[PDB]
Design a protein around this ligand. Structure first.
Ligand SMILES: OC[C@H]1O[C@@H]2OC[C@H]3O[C@H](O[C@@H]4[C@@H](O)[C@@H](OC[C@H]5O[C@H](O[C@H]([C@H]2O)[C@@H]1O)[C@H](O)[C@@H](O)[C@@H]5O)O[C@H](CO)[C@H]4O)[C@H](O)[C@@H](O)[C@@H]3O
Length: 718
């Protein structure tokens, strides 16, 4: 047997051994041809009129690590039935196929074709809307059609580029190469410069004149680079060679208003989301969740929400673990009364647990994935999978078969097609009893990045090249709507999204190690996301992955996060080994032996509770004025050049300036205070504008209040 798939697995940053590299060669480029034929003595390619012998070797891989989820998931530095050959350069369309044989038994692949492409300024295609800001329009064309547009936006000296969704490497992207595509990068997002939540939108800000911004209106992939005075924008295309480009003019907030008016905006969430969120993945039973929350109560560390990740049967992920019930063969949803819960099960009485948590004022959030596992051939999970295919609730391959997940996380799983209302209904209907009976307050909607390939088909008419980036938006929206339909606020908690995600729930920065570098990246992620209109945002403070963080990093992160839109701690699945990897304050104290951790965390959490009315009012202003909640200084201060030397500072709402302590061992910290009158919130003293240095013991993160509103904020800090 011999396999060749010209596009391959379509990992957006990687190639697979069965494919053509590159998929679309420029004219003059050679192409590398991979093929997988596990048992073959010899493999040849019939390439045009030539015959090209294949060596046994693969492309390549550092890409196989990538296909396994990247370095965070896999090493195994090394350790495949793969063959490859490099062709002559491509001067024209070539038809090719492959011939292989094992010891005198031969096979032939189907014919394939590849047409070389060239960049040209000549064409019927147009870039609409950029006015005189756009120069150098070119199109990437082949005998097949127009594949991509490209053009340049004029920049002025002093201009910064801030935007592009949620970014972990830098606030200002000028001088860098980046793209916008939804991808799950497992940790080290800043290092790779990738993101779960890209947007083809940015602020152009800081030149003497008034600033502006742009939105490429596409859900297809886009690429960006800036050198000298130009920003280069490359746009993947569908059948129509048109790029529609929106330009917004004004101060940064007004620029944002134009964008959000077009693509959507946050609505006001209940004030309780501003309290502390407690989480960890290994709280997998009723006993564990109640024990952890009891410890919160007993240590007097206030918590407003608890996330339960492994709550479920781990199959369909819509039923409590150990619940007993009659499987519905037709794949229909269950009523609450379908279920009974055994005394010895993982969750003997989940309603009583939730009622008690509610009585203490703690909200409850359940984990979700937009995936139906196929690895089980029996039970409810299998009945629902069959129902998805039968009734058309599954995202489809070009050939009409159901898409099977190509990623490393739950491979082969189906994706519910959330692009249309009927399937959004069907999928969330299975979760309805959780909200209506069990009174669950939210969903942590994890994942959403799983759709790979350009020719996938969605029921809304879109193909995968357009629709795959949109999928996480549909995903958050679906569960938001479930909550609304039960009369509850649309609180979804999501890592992934795209243009339009602004209007659905809450977002967290995703998976990271516990390191100062990850801490710094996360701040940048919140700042850039806010610049694009993502209002309720948080991260896993001091990281959820690997060994428990040291006291210093933990407390630095906790202090800063108390000043961020969403304060949450979290911990990754450890295989239930001992010792625990919990990120709870008391387990961190236990692990480090540091007796400052619990009392100082308590103070931060206690101050946090006092900040809820302020955060609530500021959130409402953010939603009304589009001036961000976690606010880079260029929004109010844009003509001040000095602000760009302190990219990790921000305004929390109008009145408070925050300066996270981002390095280990720091006994002092310097803050740049822009034009205005300031007050150190810890001493209540007046402070002048400009650079200000103060001591930073662990109980302090630098915070300053506008003098005129300090009367309102003073009780919070007393
Ligand atoms: O990159 C894929 C994935 O990696 C991590 O999970 C790998 C893990 O998946 C399966 O076990 C999971 C378990 O890890 C946990 O997942 C909750 C987790 O999901 C997201 O992060 C994961 C990594 O943990 C990432 O997507 C999310 O961002 C994070 O906040 C969450 O904590 O719990 C679920 C449910 O119990 C479990 O299915 C798989 O079984 C396991 O073998 C694999 O190592």
């Amino acid at each position: 047997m011999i396999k060749h798939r010209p596009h391959g697995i379509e990992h957006p940053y990687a190639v697979s051994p069965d494919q053509r590299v590159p998929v679309l060669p420029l004219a003059g480029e050679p192409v590398l041809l991979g093929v997988v034929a596990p048992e073959a003595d010899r493999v040849v390619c019939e390439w045009g009129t030539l015959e090209l012998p294949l060596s046994a070797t693969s492309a390549a891989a550092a890409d196989a690590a990538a296909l396994a989820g990247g370095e965070g998931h896999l090493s195994e530095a090394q350790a495949d039935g793969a063959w490859s050959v490099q062709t002559p350069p491509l001067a024209e369309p070539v038809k090719y196929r492959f011939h292989a044989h094992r010891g005198g038994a031969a096979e032939s692949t189907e014919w394939f074709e590849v047409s070389p492409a060239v960049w040209t300024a000549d064409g019927v295609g147009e870039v609409r809307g950029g006015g005189e800001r756009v120069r150098g329009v070119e199109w990437l064309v082949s005998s097949q059609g127009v594949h991509r547009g490209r053009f340049r936006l004029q920049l002025q000296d002093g201009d910064r580029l801030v935007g592009f969704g949620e970014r972990y490497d830098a606030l200002d992207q000028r001088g860098r190469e980046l793209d916008a595509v939804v991808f799950e990068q497992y940790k080290a997002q800043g290092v790779h410069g990738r993101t779960y939540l890209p947007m083809p939108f940015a602020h152009v800000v800081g030149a003497d004149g008034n600033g502006w911004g742009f939105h490429v209106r596409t859900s297809r992939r886009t690429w960006y680079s800036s050198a000298g005075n130009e920003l280069t924008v490359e746009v993947a295309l569908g059948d129509e060679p048109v790029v529609d480009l929106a330009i917004y003019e004004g101060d940064p907030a007004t620029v944002l208003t134009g964008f959000l008016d077009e693509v959507g905006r946050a609505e006001e969430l209940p004030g309780w989301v501003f309290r502390l969120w407690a989480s960890g993945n290994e709280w997998n039973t009723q006993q564990l969740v109640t024990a952890r929350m009891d410890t919160h109560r007993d240590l007097a560390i206030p918590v407003g929400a608890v996330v339960i990740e492994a709550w479920s049967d781990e199959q369909g992920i819509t039923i409590w673990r150990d619940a007993v019930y009659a499987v519905t063969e037709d794949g229909s949803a269950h009523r609450a009364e379908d279920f009974s819960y055994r005394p010895d099960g993982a969750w003997p009485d989940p309603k009583a647990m939730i009622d008690e948590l509610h009585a203490r004022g703690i909200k409850v959030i359940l984990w979700q994935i937009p995936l139906q596992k196929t690895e089980f051939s029996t039970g409810q999970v299998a009945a629902d999978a069959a129902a998805m295919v039968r009734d058309g609730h599954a995202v489809l391959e070009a050939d009409g078969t159901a898409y099977r997940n190509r990623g490393w996380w739950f491979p082969q799983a189906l994706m519910p097609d959330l692009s249309v209302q009927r399937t959004r209904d069907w999928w969330t209907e299975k979760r309805r009893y959780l909200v209506e009976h069990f009174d669950v307050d939210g969903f942590k909607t994890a994942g959403g990045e799983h759709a790979w390939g350009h020719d996938l088909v969605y029921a809304d008419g879109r193909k995968g090249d357009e629709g795959n980036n949109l999928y996480p938006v549909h995903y958050a929206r679906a569960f938001g709507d479930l909550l609304r339909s039960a009369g509850k606020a649309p609180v979804t908690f999501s890592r992934a999204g795209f243009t339009g995600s602004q209007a659905h729930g809450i977002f967290w920065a995703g998976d990271e190690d516990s390191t100062w570098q990850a801490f710094r990246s996360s701040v940048t992620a919140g700042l850039t996301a806010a610049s694009c209109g993502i209002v309720y945002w948080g991260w896993d403070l001091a990281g959820f992955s690997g060994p428990v963080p040291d006291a210093e990093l933990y407390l630095r992160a906790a202090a800063a996060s108390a000043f961020m839109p969403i304060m949450q701690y979290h911990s990754e699945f450890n295989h239930h080994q001992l010792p625990l990897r919990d990120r709870t304050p008391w387990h961190v104290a236990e692990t480090t032996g540091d007796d400052r951790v619990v009392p100082l965390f308590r103070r931060f959490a206690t101050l946090r509770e006092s900040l809820v009315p302020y955060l609530t009012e500021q959130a409402a202003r953010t939603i009304a004025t589009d001036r961000p909640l976690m606010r880079p200084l260029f929004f109010d201060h844009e003509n001040d050049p000095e602000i760009w030397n302190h990219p990790y500072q921000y305004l929390l709402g109008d009145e408070l300036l925050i300066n996270p302590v981002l390095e280990p061992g720091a006994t002092t910290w310097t803050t740049y205070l822009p034009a205005g009158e300031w007050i150190d919130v810890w001493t209540g003293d007046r402070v002048p504008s400009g650079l200000v240095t103060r001591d930073v013991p662990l109980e302090v993160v630098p915070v300053y209040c506008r003098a005129s509103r300090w009367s309102e904020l003073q009780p919070v800090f007393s």
